[PDB]
Amino acid sequence: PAILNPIARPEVPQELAENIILTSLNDVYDWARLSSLWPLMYGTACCFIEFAAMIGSRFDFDRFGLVPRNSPRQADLIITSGTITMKMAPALVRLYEQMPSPKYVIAMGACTITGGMFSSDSYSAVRGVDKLIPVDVYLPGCPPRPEAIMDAIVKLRKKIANEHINERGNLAQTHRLFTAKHKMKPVPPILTGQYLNAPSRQAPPPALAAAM
Template identity: 75%
Template sequence: MTLTPSSPGTSEAPSIEALRDLRAATCNPVGAPTVTSDLSENVILTSLDDLHNWARLSSLWPLLYGTACCFIEFAALIGSRFDFDRFGLVPRSSPRQADLLITAGTVTMKMAPALVRLYEQMPEPKYVIAMGACTITGGMFSADSTTAVRGVDKLIPVDLYIPGCPPRPEAIFDAVIKLRKKVGNEALAERGNLQPTHRYLTIEHAMKPVEPIVTGSYLRAETQKAAFAAGAGLPLATPEPEALEATPSSSDA
């Protein structure tokens, strides 16, 4: 567009649109930017809780506490087939750098103080996932063992339980997704007001010597006798209840 000086009375002055186009062509060859009127595509309205929760659920750093066979599932979980890292999960070796504790395997009385110590060293907010039957209820060791803990929820608070012996990696992913939803719905004030419960060696959970409850009487059941006979291929001589009662125990000695 070309503009020539106008003489008085010969032509009209250039319009506002012409001057605007001339300025845009000389000062900004690319052209004047246009601002869309749809603010929903350019402005995101959120709260501090949502922003904080979005950052936390996208970067959960787990501390893997494995004591038995369920822990072997993490070998497949971290591999390229399941891609453990796509959820932002970065396994840590120090509890002070982790906010998620995943327990897998049997927890004994000797390992219980170590588990609670690791949990107490984790910064708030922190979460716990109990993985496998032995971690949740004691599993197959809950019947005979006198040292197996019947569930880690007697020691530390648990947010999610993953049943199975062992659980598949897909079940662990499902638990992580549910935990991410829980983190996304939390508020800072609510998480700070939660009272710590289920601590080891507190007044409610003080360890006291008690009489043994595992007596082995279930071995004298007819179903167990039949299982023993079928497994050995010949009849087994099981002790009678009177013989067991007459045998002196180690506590009497």
């Protein structure tokens, strides 16, 4: 039209009424979520060791209230510390959907912002983590310093405080569900759980051992 990728006008008045009592009960709603938010102990590529160095003694993890919870339900924040390929891209959306709705992804490193150095010619790399999940803070680096991600926590902590308590309803996903029927043949699952006792490892087959 006249402007590509436009911004839709918010037609609602956004009447965010707040007296002295609700604003005091909103500062506690935000302070309790920024000062104790728990990151899922997650990371695929090299950038997790710049995130695991922040668990250590030199740069303190649990100083901003970060406790690394290795389960998607008990965690809220998810620092994407690794390159997302074609595999692990369904796994990451699953760990993001398995989360209580004040989530706050932060990207980490160049390969979750734009898929940084695999953004040029690489056949299975998601070019940026926000092709999959909505992100709050970005963090350039390859890898970032452990000081550099604690600035991205500080940028995240400044973003939790802006969140009003009356906007808890917009944190839930909406289901514009459509359905369609197809005629694609279902394939048997190629990855079955047997490796060693598969019927091809016990002995070399005939019409192969004659040339051996």
